[PDB]
Ligand binder design. Structure first.
Ligand SMILES: CC(=O)N[C@H]1[C@H](Oc2ccc([N+](=O)[O-])cc2)O[C@H](CO)[C@@H](O[C@@H]2O[C@@H](C)[C@@H](O)[C@@H](O)[C@@H]2O)[C@@H]1O[C@@H]1O[C@H](CO)[C@H](O)[C@H](O)[C@H]1O
Ligand SMILES: CC(=O)N[C@@H]1[C@@H](O[C@@H]2O[C@H](CO)[C@H](O)[C@H](O)[C@H]2O)[C@H](O[C@@H]2O[C@@H](C)[C@@H](O)[C@@H](O)[C@@H]2O)[C@@H](CO)O[C@H]1O
Ligand code: NA
Ligand code: NA
Lengths: 302, 311
């Protein structure tokens, strides 16, 4: 089967770290930025990595059991199936927002009542000893004075980390999945700046909450979720060091820039000096597969 | 080109339990028939022709689905709708902005926040409630009405429905997610609504994909939201735009462990699936959720399906 990418304009595609439209295409503010996102990680032959779900249905949700009067949520998969401890960093689709506090909204499932607001607010710190999703649990900040059961929900908004006090949100980072005595197993590996004139391309969407900059919380990811779903369904073999893509204006059919999609599931371009890069481009473009190329193929600056 | 006009029809090759509801972003949790065999549906989301033509308020992807955005003035009750990206909603063109919720016969309990963030402290989340059968619910005209006066700063707000409850009026009536809200008004009907989908008859019945949505109901059971197509099907069709080459696409719902066919279904060009229930009580709800629908062949609308399930 021949390799393709979705024929849908970028602005209509979705972030792979939480379900939202892509609102920008950027380079990392720090050129030396290494990333290790656990969601939005997929080899271009359809091999999912980290905690990455095949589809958005599973993405950015948390599910587990909690006892009345406890602080600990014992995680399951989003569909309610048991989470295998020591095996994965966290359940499939578990949020990977590091360096922030999580303000979550959850509810007991399934509904078994005829009245009442089922929604509960809980907060989670991601750098505390109780944050151990790799061991199957996370700890809420307060005692959970609500009925025992199976709860499901998501992060509604984020804020500056509680510790160290004063530090800002940094969504380029992931939380600490492991424990003080055990590292998280099967983490999707880090992605390093490619060098040689190339730079990693990130897709960004805004997420609710304050920060020290009084500005939007921007969530960078490596691939649109629809690309991941496509790769999982298509399972097209990788036949070069990179897939050459053209970013095309669908209205005129003009090529707006060349990109390389690497087998590891990330995109690069060559910025044409400072001030240049994919952030200069309109967001209504469609990426089109042109050809398999070697890693030594020299990209035209964008 | 020749390639585009000769592009072969396909469906996403992913187990059903891994696919998403097209009325709100969530995993599909079951397949059902409508409780009423005569049930007509007119969902505005999850509507797409199998050659990729979107209908109603249906978004191409999940990123835009089940979101509400608009401007509200401090001290007012009126949310003036925009598209999810903040661009003006061209009213009279559509029943509502793309991705706008289509949950009828219930009260909406929403959570919204001012966008973009311009704050360095505090909780930005605001709770509002919306009734869908009141005079102020006029999304087609460009606005919906909150139940209480909005005593928060004027501006641009984005959010979603967090949970639903029984409709306020008529008192005592239950949630009915088989229905859509009234998008129009008394002096103006909603233009360009996705059309109704009628039961096929002649042994066939419509297949619905369900996912539970938070909130109570009169039956003390989950609020199951039925939709016609997984969202991934919609995205696939929009991307592929494969020409429709027959009256219907014959699908087999195949067990990925044994490669055996668990049931025959017809996917009609209007963007919905049917099966033949194997007697009273039988249906696709009896099948495991880990099956994969595979395209077998184009067939005529008169093609008869092997009955599915057991009475
Ligand atoms: C636990 C909590 O709610 N902390 C609040 C804090 O609350 C109180 C409570 C009682 C007293 N008192 O006895 O006098 C004083 C303060 O109030 C501050 C100031 O409003 C909150 O911090 C601010 O808002 C949050 C959302 C952040 O944006 C923060 O930077 C602001 O200064 C504080 O909220 C906590 O802040 C910490 C970081 O300091 C984390 O972000 C927590 O998630 C957040 O709950
Ligand atoms: C305005 C308000 O807060 N009313 C309270 C009721 O909630 C409303 O119920 C109506 C249905 O009558 C409708 O669902 C609205 O959306 C609710 O705001 C509340 O009713 C109870 O809880 C509801 C969520 C619903 O499940 C209903 O069946 C149930 O009776 C009553 C009782 O707690 O208090 C009212 O003040
Ligand atoms: Na940890
Ligand atoms: Na109305």
């Amino acid at each position: 089967r021949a390799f393709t990418v979705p024929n849908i304009p970028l602005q209509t595609l979705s972030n792979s770290r939480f379900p939202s439209l892509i609102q920008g295409m950027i380079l990392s503010p720090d050129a030396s930025q290494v990333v290790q996102f656990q969601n939005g990680r997929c080899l271009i032959d359809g091999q999912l990595l980290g905690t990455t779900p095949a589809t958005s249905g599973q993405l950015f949700r948390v599910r587990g059991k909690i006892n009345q009067g406890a602080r600990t949520l014992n995680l399951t998969e989003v569909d309610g199936k048991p989470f295998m401890a020591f095996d994965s960093p966290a359940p499939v689709g578990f949020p990977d927002f590091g360096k922030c506090d999580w303000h979550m909204r959850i509810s007991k499932t399934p509904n078994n009542t005829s009245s009442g607001d089922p929604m509960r607010s809980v907060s989670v710190q991601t750098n505390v000893q109780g944050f151990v999703p790799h061991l199957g649990s996370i700890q809420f900040d307060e005692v959970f004075n609500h009925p025992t059961g199976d709860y499901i929900g998501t992060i509604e908004w984020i804020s500056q980390p509680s510790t160290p006090p004063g530090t800002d949100i940094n969504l380029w980072e992931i939380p600490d999945y492991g424990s003080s005595l055990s590292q998280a197993a099967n983490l999707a590996p880090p992605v390093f700046p490619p060098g040689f004139g190339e730079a990693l391309v990130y897709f960004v969407s805004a997420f609710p909450g304050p920060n020290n900059r009084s500005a939007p919380n921007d969530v960078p990811c490596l691939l649109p979720q629809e690309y991941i779903t496509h790769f999982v369904s298509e399972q097209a073999p990788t036949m070069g060091d990179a897939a050459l893509l053209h970013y095309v204006d669908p209205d005129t059919n003009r090529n707006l820039g060349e990109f390389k999609l690497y087998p590891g599931g990330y995109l690069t371009c060559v910025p044409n000096g400072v001030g240049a890069g994919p952030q200069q481009l309109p967001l209504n473009g469609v990426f089109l597969f042109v050809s398999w190329v070697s890693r030594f193929y020299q990209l035209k600056p964008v």
